[PDB]
Design a protein around this ligand. Structure first.
Ligand SMILES: *P(=O)(O)OCC(C)(C)[C@@H](O)C(=O)NCCC(=O)NCCS
Length: 513
């Protein structure tokens, strides 16, 4: 859960009165001492629901370490260790068997490069990347028991690297290349394309992963390692690499041993599932949302992307509102989405799905893989509260949920047993997420680089609101909507209405919702 990490940073900043806190910034090296250390733990006791003392601060002086401190550590298995599929990977494989996703679970990463890269050096660098990260060369094959992992040896992993020439606009070409399907039984879950043409200055480098091998937090290590391997291979050498503290299979094995069996009443899995069964009792099948078309018989996973720019002064005001009320920026956005759906007539019981990263362990905090569980965050709006009251409700709901974040979403579904439809995501149909793009990726491959956004043609749910921060200060709200249900202009209006809710909440949070 990254939310613990963000509030620790928030408290460090308020007590040291700085603007310098990263996840690895040492509290004592930052000018903190024991007198202020008690102010930090006193504030953390009030925000988080947990006992914290100077003891914890001493042994875990950074936000990332303190967050993880508040289950065994990942251990490296032997060189002959077989691959292990996490429950995350099994669920994603299962989705691709039930549905025709049309690439909805591919994730793009596109980088504008001022110089055209060398294709032979790039292909060699991708081989180094795939050799380093076993998850990038692990196939999934169907057997009578179910899906089984197949780890390709580095010499046997055929990388897919090619140059493509843009005829029309590159933006639509990026989305087209991104949506191409992976055969997970025969192709490694990574595709690399270098887009060139006379309308593009330099090239656009597009990495496409299937989510089975990468979440959005993998962007930074993917770019960092690809950059290291490219510059090394351009000088004619293999990269000088400190080996990985853990492979994805190590994390999956450690996690599954700890989780246990759902039939074991003492297992963490059963105990967390029992929390969710009670927390999701009498859950609505779906929310009454204003759509343009009824739910079709079959889900097409077609979608679009409506964007709402946020002025830097509004981004700052949302940050200050969160700090003043002791919540994260995500919690403010989550409350705003709940207000929005409430005002649209969805009722007082608003369940919103949200991805939570299981990256607290040092050995996986900055590695490549899929670590996102989906939690159902159930917001109650009865008794017409103020926005400040709602922020208190949302913090309570989120913190109780984050303490049971390891229950796999598919097990929670099978525990809650909701009425199921192939055209409707179970338990929730609106997702809210907070994302931060990599920083310091502006000078990769010895050139000038900048991330470029890919316009999705797909959607996973009815609605996904994302507060997305770029690596350099700015922020915007992206609404990924199901085209089956919503026209583009209705989505543009929805995301504009969310911005208006945020503006009103910052201006005066003491007004009822
Ligand atoms: P804080 O760490 O800034 O300041 C406390 C102190 C360094 C001034 C010091 O006087 C102190 O903590 N002494 C207590 C340490 C101690 O005796 N440990 C208990 C285990 S025997």
């Amino acid at each position: 859960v990254t939310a613990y990490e963000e509030i620790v940073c928030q408290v460090f900043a308020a007590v040291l009165d700085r603007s310098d806190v990263t996840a690895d910034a040492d509290f004592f090296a930052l000018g903190g001492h024991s007198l202020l250390s008690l102010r930090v733990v006193a504030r953390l006791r009030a925000l988080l629901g947990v006992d914290v003392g100077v003891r914890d601060l001493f042994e875990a002086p950074t936000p990332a370490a303190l967050a993880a401190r508040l289950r065994p550590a990942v251990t490296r298995r032997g060189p002959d260790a077989p691959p292990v599929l996490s429950h995350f990977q099994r669920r994603l494989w299962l989705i691709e068997q039930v549905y025709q996703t049309r690439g909805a679970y591919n994730v793009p990463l596109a980088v504008h490069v001022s110089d055209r890269l060398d294709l032979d050096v790039l292909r060699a660098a991708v081989r180094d990347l795939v050799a380093r990260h076993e998850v990038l060369r692990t196939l999934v094959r169907s057997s009578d028991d179910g899906p089984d992992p197949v780890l390709l040896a580095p010499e046997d992993a055929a990388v897919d690297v090619a140059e493509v020439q843009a005829a029309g606009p590159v933006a639509d070409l990026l989305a087209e290349l991104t949506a191409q399907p992976f055969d997970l039984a025969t192709q490694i879950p990574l595709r690399v394309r270098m887009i060139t043409g006379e309308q593009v200055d330099g090239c656009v480098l597009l990495l496409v992963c299937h989510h089975i091998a990468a979440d959005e937090w993998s962007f930074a290590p993917l770019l960092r390692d690809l950059d290291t391997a490219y510059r090394a291979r351009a000088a004619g050498r293999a990269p000088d690499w400190e080996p990985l503290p853990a492979q994805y299979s190590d994390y999956a094995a450690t996690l599954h041993d700890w989780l246990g069996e759902a039939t074991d009443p003492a297992s963490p899995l059963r105990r967390q599932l029992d929390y969710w069964q009670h927390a999701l009792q009498d859950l609505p099948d779906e929310l009454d949302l204003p759509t343009d078309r009824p739910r079709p018989a079959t889900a097409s996973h077609r979608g679009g992307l409506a964007r709402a720019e946020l002025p830097p002064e509004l981004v700052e005001a949302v940050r200050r509102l969160a700090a003043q009320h002791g919540v994260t920026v995500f919690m403010v956005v989550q409350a705003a989405v709940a207000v929005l759906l409430h005002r649209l007539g969805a009722g007082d019981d608003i369940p919103l799905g949200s991805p939570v990263a299981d990256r607290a362990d040092e050995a996986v905090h900055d590695t490549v893989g899929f670590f996102l569980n989906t939690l159902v965050l159930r917001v109650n709006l009865s008794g017409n509260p103020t926005f400040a009251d709602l922020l208190d409700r949302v913090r309570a709901v989120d913190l109780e949920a984050f303490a049971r974040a390891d229950a796999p979403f598919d097990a929670v579904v099978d525990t809650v047993k909701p009425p199921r439809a192939v055209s409707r995501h179970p338990l929730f149909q609106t997702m809210v997420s907070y994302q931060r793009r990599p920083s310091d990726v502006d000078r990769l491959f010895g050139a000038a680089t900048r991330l470029v956004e890919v316009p999705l043609d797909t959607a996973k749910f009815d609605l996904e609101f994302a507060f997305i921060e770029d690596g350099h200060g700015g922020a915007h709200i992206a609404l990924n909507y199901a085209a089956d249900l919503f026209d583009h202009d209705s989505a543009e209006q929805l995301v504009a209405r969310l911005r208006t809710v945020l503006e009103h909440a910052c201006a005066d949070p003491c007004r009822p919702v």
